[PDB]
Amino acid sequence: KPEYMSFGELFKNSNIFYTPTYQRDYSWEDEQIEQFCNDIQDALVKKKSKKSCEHFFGGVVCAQEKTFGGHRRIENLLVDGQQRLSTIVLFFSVIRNVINSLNCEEDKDSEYRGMILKDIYKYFYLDERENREIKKHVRITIGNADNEFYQSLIDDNPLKGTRNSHELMLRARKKFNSFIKDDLFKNRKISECLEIIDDIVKLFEESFLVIHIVTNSIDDAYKLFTGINLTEGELLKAHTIGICSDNLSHQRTISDNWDAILKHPSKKVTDYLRWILIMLTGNNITASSVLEEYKKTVFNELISKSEIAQTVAYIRDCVERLEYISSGEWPFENNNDNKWHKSKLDLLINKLKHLHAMPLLLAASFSSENNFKHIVNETSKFFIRCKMISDLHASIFSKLYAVLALRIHKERDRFDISKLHGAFNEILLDKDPEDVRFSTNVRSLIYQKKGDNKPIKCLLMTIQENWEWLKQPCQGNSLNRLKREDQTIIFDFNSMTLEHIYPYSALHEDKDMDMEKLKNNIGNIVLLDPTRNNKNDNKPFIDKKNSFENTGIGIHSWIYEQKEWTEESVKKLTETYVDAAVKVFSFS
Amino acid sequence: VKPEYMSFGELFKNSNIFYTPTYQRDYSWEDEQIEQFCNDIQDALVKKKSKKSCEHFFGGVVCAQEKTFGGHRRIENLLVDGQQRLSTIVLFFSVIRNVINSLNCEEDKDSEYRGMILKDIYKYFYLDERENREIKKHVRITIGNADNEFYQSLIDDNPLKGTRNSHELMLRARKKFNSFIKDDLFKNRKISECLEIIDDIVKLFEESFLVIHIVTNSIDDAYKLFTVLNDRGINLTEGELLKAHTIGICSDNLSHQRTISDNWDAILKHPSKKVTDYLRWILIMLTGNNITASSVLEEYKKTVFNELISKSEIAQTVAYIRDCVERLEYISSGEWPFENNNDNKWHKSKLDLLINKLKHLHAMPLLLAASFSSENNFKHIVNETSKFFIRCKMISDLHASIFSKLYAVLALRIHKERDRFDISKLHGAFNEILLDKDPEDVRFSTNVRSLIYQKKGDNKPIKCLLMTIQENWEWLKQPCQGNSLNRLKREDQTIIFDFNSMTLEHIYPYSALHEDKDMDMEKLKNNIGNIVLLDPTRNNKNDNKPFIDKKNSFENTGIGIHSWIYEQKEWTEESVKKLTETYVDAAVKVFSFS
């Protein structure tokens, strides 16, 4: 059935290729350039026996093809594949330059070299006659920052080179020379040497294929895979400037702000833009539709008052913050010690990798620093209960955080914390009526023999930090809990100690054969004190009691009181945990 | 100059029969995918009231082979990308069809506008194969083993009861489509108006909602078109693809097919990214030749899953692949892989640093191979690698390819040598790189020298440095011996620093009161020569006041550089210069492997 075409065919036909405006810099590194050569050689090797067909880079995606509006005969707005075609040309400039310097005394420069040279002419130029003049254009033109220098490389008279991409090209060529001269020519006579290049020419003609896909617009091409060449950032840079046509001032402001955004690499740009939008709109917009939604909501004509110019600058500022918050780091200046909350932000996204919260936090950062502080803290507690302890589907977070994120964006410092609780509370009533699913889970928590034990550690740590408020006689309201919570201790999971009250590993003297069934149950587990008290304990309860004498951790009191630790005392702690778990992870 | 497209309707007007590949992944769209599917419909409906309503959705339905000569129905299509979009159209029409089950016999529109629109839309559900004697109408979309049972039932409006999370998603999708047409669209509309929009719905899926049908040559090829950067409704990964290829080799010994099939099943439990990442890091370990993401499918096929290796080892490897995948589940998130009974907390903290705090994923093939070595060899690698990464990436900024070969080769050597590997190899390996990229330590040295305190960050670079010289201080001081193995033996493991509670003090004060504000010194204030770590426990810094009124901080403390600082009379530009050199010197010694 299917129709495929070789790379030669792409250049055989009268095609001219050119990149989009805002085409990203060349990005092929040695990993790509080696693979490009080794692909060749596998197929040279296979030549001796079996087939060399390779479906290279299936898909050279083109966005328009004007036969009367071309650059020369058929313009192609290359959306994906530019690198490959670009380098292929580069590679052939190397084949031409190596060959041209071969000795070639007898019947080669006379014959075979010239026959090879006409067959690759097509990778460099396309001749066209108007009357008596043979005007001839180049077959591929790359990004604006690069093209000038690339062309230089193809003319084998390179320019100096002003940036990374220029260099990345220079190395690929350096590598190509080594690949032909050293790795393929090796030790061979000119006739043996041409024979192998004639096979390279023939590979690109017959064996190396792609699917040539034509498309109606840049956006449609782009939609085929929603980012070596174009991100949403580049498309928005373009759209956004195109909106500010008359005002040549607003443009330069915008171009600059986008360039600062586009510096950062593909994945992070797109992910930031998504998060930013989710905030602004208050909807869990899907990855593909981000490009579309940006234009419908944030960048449009009713919108289009050169507010867009302001918004672009707002995007940058958001990006500058996200570089802190995406890596778990505090967005505000360091003076306020604020270490305890700083420890939460790190926990929340470096340790538990709860990125969903991002638009929340971003919007939070545009509120007050106290707000940010409380939002981070609480949003942890939520995530812990909801997905560390319970295993709810993450879609719980999607819609919740988006409205919140939006709320906070409008309300800023007049945003009040209580909104967060009610918000969290709603959701938790719906999915957990009487704090009964949360409870059953906390109850069925087992210590892990291999983990860092995040889920148990999160639970203990947090109740401990909200212990004082647990034992305050009445009300225990969540807003009071947030005012009267312990921030003096910054718990490190790496140095946290999780004690087995009935010992983890007991020998014959310690016995209790059917207490062994009980160990690992949460009820047989306490957070030891990491305050200077040093937890070098392996023994039975009676022996190891000094561990709980008069220490900073709340539940240690009642653990001391026990003359012995039995099946029943395990049940008695389990419920104490399960209880405070509920009061401490509930919201009002 | 005109490019080809086709609508979802044209797709279905032809005599197509769409099916998924074997092992096609479970249905994965959630409320954000469907809330978009719907908002797409209404905007086009709102744009119908003025301008054009064209819209290129899921451009790129990609089939793998075609047969019309002899078909189950006329034309059969193996879908490798598109299924999920096409499936929630069949779903969404089934929902319109039950919403035209609202007004029975009602006023000359049933046989006119309801019987008609039923048949104009009949096409998404069944394709009438008239056949030799008996009419055989088949369903026009099939979606791989897990769902198809439950799915077929739902469109019919005779739903089964869910057994998987996927089953719920479709059930939610149905339920949300219900609500849309009745509450968003039909909301106070004369049923004449209502039919008018149901009708104008089909017209979009006829004329306005386009795609690009691509026909590929093989499944591999269809997948190659997705080699780079697509993330929604993944129907396959290298994992699923590899399961077929590996089964296809181990077929005529069912013993292997069952053990194989169940392992990949266990593997393929994990979400696709983790799967393709894990698969690469293992291949790298198995070859010692770090290989482009874009080539993992093939390099698995001509290396560890070839025909000359068709020795039933294949099934043992696939099992091994799963051993690794279990391990990688821990290491990947910085969590210790061994039985954590034997405390080893300090090294645990270094793994969490390396993977969760500094994010040096490049190391996974190395870390993985080491986990198959002694837990000692593991301990030491995580340690020494964190040293090398701090040096090369956090302080210096050598480009990440440096690591790519270095680790690939090391991971093999560790895989091959196992528990009788010796650390001095890892040091040598590291040491060769530094002899190459930084022969006389001058690059690393100046980078250290020009480290500045950050007004906003966590200061991870300066912290990585001061903690690490701090932790190796009794070795920096000893009557000099200078051996990397020596350092490793003598190294302090008694404190476990938490970046969140670690304190960086400016020796000349951060914000100095004018009475104490020397101006030449301010040009230095944030330079590392004026920065020191503080005893985490014990003393806590709160004070931005002058050196002299501030000397109590260093007196009899746990951290070595304090002794010298205590000994000063004043804190001059000259004393700064001196410290810089000390830090530069400590670094060069603590961060080398000779």
Residue numbers in the entry:
A (entry chain B): 4 to 229, 235 to 596
B (entry chain A): 3 to 596
Q: Please, what does the article write about this entry?
A:
In PT-based Dnd defense systems, DndABCDE serves as the modification component to catalyze double-stranded DNA PT modification at the 5′-GPSAAC-3′/5′-GPSTTC-3′ sites (PS, phosphate-sulfur linkage), while DndFGH utilizes sequence-specific PT modification as the recognition tag to discriminate against and eliminate invasive foreign DNA lacking PT modification. Although it has been confirmed that iscS-dndBCDE and dndFGH form an antiphage defense system, in this study, we found that a dndI gene, situated within the dndFGHI operon, also constitutes a PT-based antiphage defense system along with the iscS-dndBCDE module.
Moreover, we resolved the crystal structure of DndI from Salmonella at a resolution of 3.10 Å. In each asymmetric unit, DndI forms a homodimer, where each protomer of DndI consists of a smaller N-terminal domain (residues 1–238, hereinafter DndINTD) and a larger C-terminal domain (residues 239–596, hereinafter DndICTD). The conserved D83GQQR87 motif, a key motif for NTP hydrolysis, is located at the junction of the α3 helix and the β3 sheet of DndINTD. Unlike the typical HNH motif observed in Colicin E9 (39), ScoMcrA, Cas9 (41), BrxU and Ref, which is composed of an α-helix and two antiparallel β-strands, the HNH motif located in DndICTD consists of two β-strands and a loop, showing similarities to the HNH motif found in SspE of Streptomcyes yokosukanensis DSM 40224 (27). The CTDs of DndI and SspE exhibit a lower extent of structural similarity (with an RMSD of 4.9 Å for 325 Cα atoms) in comparison to the NTDs (with an RMSD of 3.0 Å for 219 Cα atoms). Significantly, the Y25 residue, which is equivalent to Y30 that mediates the PT responsiveness in SspE from S. yokosukanensis DSM 40224, was situated in a hydrophobic cavity within the N-terminal ATPase domain of DndI. To further understand how PT modification modulates other enzymatic activities of DndI, electrophoretic mobility shift assay (EMSA) was conducted, which showed that the binding affinity of DndICTD with DNA (Kd = 0.66 μM) was 14-fold greater than that of full-length DndI (Kd = 9.31 μM), indicating the inhibitory impact of the NTD on the CTD.
